[PDB]
Amino acid sequence: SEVPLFDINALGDWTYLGTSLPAKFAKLFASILHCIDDEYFLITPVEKVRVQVEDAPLLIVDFERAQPHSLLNVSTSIGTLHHNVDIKQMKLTDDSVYLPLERGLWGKLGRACYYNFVNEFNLSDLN
Ligand code: NA
């Protein structure tokens, strides 16, 4: 065990060595976060380290289509922004809905945007 030094809880909040990271620090580290074969890492040339993730690495708190019927832009609780997000590729558990983002990362839909997400569906999203 490399016990991971970075932890992301189910609500998307990060710690390092057990200390809470401010959102902007979580956003800095998220820029180099990947999920490879179901395991999470921060990846740089010199340092490649593990991250423990309770649920999803990112919590989606807002979304919009760039244009009618387009793919989605989403933003997260730590302030990251993601483009070209495809409703058709969503994944459900019995508890939550997840959307696929870059670098193998999935974003969990936050409770406060759930109903708005359901309302957003267009039949064209299945095309
Ligand atoms: Na709709």
Residue numbers in the entry: 29 to 155
Which statements did the authors publish about this structure?
To extend the structural coverage of proteins with uncharacterized biological function, we targeted Pfam protein family Pfam06938 (DUF1285), for which we determined the structures of two representative members. The first structural representatives of the DUF1285 family revealed a novel fold consisting of repeated motifs. The structures revealed a conserved core with domain duplication and a superficial similarity of the C-terminal domain to pleckstrin homology-like folds. The conservation of the domain interface indicates a potential binding site that is likely to involve a nucleotide-based ligand, with genome-context and gene-fusion analyses additionally supporting a role for this family in signal transduction, possibly during oxidative stress.
